[PDB]
Curated annotation (Swiss-Prot), chains A, B, C, D:
Gene that produces this protein: FTL
UniProt keywords, alphabetically: Acetylation, Cytoplasm, Cytoplasmic vesicle, Iron, Iron storage, Lysosome, Metal-binding
Note: In horse spleen the light chain is the major chain.
This protein's name: Ferritin light chain
Pfam families, per the entry: Ferritin
């Protein structure tokens, strides 16, 4: 590449993997959103919460792809694995599964930051810090806050309804 | 002081102590506010309630300091003791601890009013009446109203959630 | 903590200490502000300068406390020591004491950044860089500029008056 | 009087005396204002400061007269003594003379408050507190602040000019 400078093959490859992880997270949230839209689940606030997250994760993937080209690396796409579950249980179950998912994305971000630091690639390090690291910390805090409120609420059917109506 | 008139050393000293008490109350409310912001407590309305009170108590301290200088007394600051607890339990526990705190500030205000009256210092007496006495009575009534509603609500987890969502 | 990830006990503890340092700085500035409001000092611009800084330092402490919870650490408060002086001398004396204070806060920030880097905690490192490091550099430059102008001005009484009227 | 209730002859008489004191203060400030308007003194900011105070003191007298009638007492006017000086010296001299004057009015207010309290006349006590006591404390603080700045400024001719230009 005529533009490529200080951009290691290791980082290029890790950025392609992180794109896959963000698209997979987007897909998992799409499944979670539509599960809560089922007439036999019917929690519209929970559905909107996960659909909004699907869109956020897709946006993350696209920003990473933009960066990959800005640096002169080459986007390589892999299959996107189907989500780990077809049915997601209660709001509590689903929020637990979301925080597991977010912590795995955060750990991927931290790993790539570490790699960037080892490779002396400050543009990569700044890029993750300014667009992803604080967003993940904020989101995981929010999910943790939700999980605590869900747990304090679950006569389980009444709790789930009230959380969806008054928090989401 | 060239301006000092009818301002006893006793009152000057009691005003410095009351500044300390208001700053300590502010600090206690800061701790209460951040405790309810913990991801394993997560009651944002309770958090905002106490943070707003932190700011009110700090404002009170500053008005007292302004008055101290208006009268020609000299502000003397002491250490601010850390709050009595590191963790504040339930909303009920925290509201009980707040009303204990407010009654101790109110009693300090009443003591200083009594002192002012004994010293024939009507400016001090008017100052407490117009800026602090009615504010404390209003706040203690509000906390009493909250305590009653909290108590009537505590399936405890559901009650705490509903109070935070629908009152705070 | 269900949310805690890559957040060392060392950093958690250093963040609690830095909160104390910022609250202590806030308190020191409150004392400086009210000293310049004394009828026998009476430099209102100097008073507003330090009171504004009291508020900035309190805001800093609250942002650190917010971050502590966002990361799943636990806020622990200690006593707040009274400021080092009861009377602050001239504007020159007070500005010298402020720059000493700011350099000690800056060094604390730098120490915590170093710790964060040693612990591979990029979120902490970005947080200090984006909210505190440049603010301190800007403020210390401003105080240095003030100190130079104060010094060039001190017939001392006339200089102090003119600085307060035409700079602050 | 058909309306008179709980209004002692002692208080009625002291209120008439206080009216005289406020009108005398108004007159003294009128003289001070016009002295600083002399072409051989020529400090327009000092002139406006004292003329504004003339008007404030006259307003005070009129509020006291209104109150006297509201209570069913009878206004009795005495001669208004000419001010203590025909020429008022420097701004420093004049500000010293103003603070002496204000402290004598404040002491009169405090004496009348004490009388009102001895007579169990809470309307009188509230009236002085709400309209006069805090106004005097604020004004005496302001004059004290001015006196300190004037003193710090007095090459005397330059100091007097700068105070008038940059403070008043
Ligand atoms: C409002 C936060 C707070 C609490 C306790 C003490 C201080 C000193 C100013 C403070 O700002
Ligand atoms: C405000 C000028 C002034 C001074 C002193 C006395 C009187 C009588 C009304 C007056 O108007």
């Amino acid at each position: 590449s005529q533009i490529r400078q200080n951009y290691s093959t290791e980082v290029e490859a890790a950025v392609n993997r992180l794109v896959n992880l963000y698209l997979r997270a987007s897909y998992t949230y799409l499944s979670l959103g539509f599960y809560f839209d089922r007439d036999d689940v019917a929690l519209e606030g929970v559905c909107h919460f996960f659909r909004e997250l699907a869109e956020e994760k897709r946006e993350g993937a696209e920003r990473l792809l933009k960066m990959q080209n800005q640096r002169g690396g080459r986007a390589l796409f892999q299959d996107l694995q189907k989500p780990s579950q077809d049915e997601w249980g209660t709001t509590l179950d689903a929020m637990k599964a979301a925080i597991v998912l977010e912590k795995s994305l955060n750990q991927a971000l931290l790993d790539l930051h570490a790699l960037g630091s080892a490779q002396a690639d400050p543009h990569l390090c700044d890029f993750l810090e300014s667009h992803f690291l604080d967003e993940e910390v904020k989101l995981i805090k929010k999910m943790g806050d939700h999980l605590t409120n869900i747990q304090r609420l679950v006569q389980a059917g009444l709790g789930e309804y009230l959380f969806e109506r008054l928090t989401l």
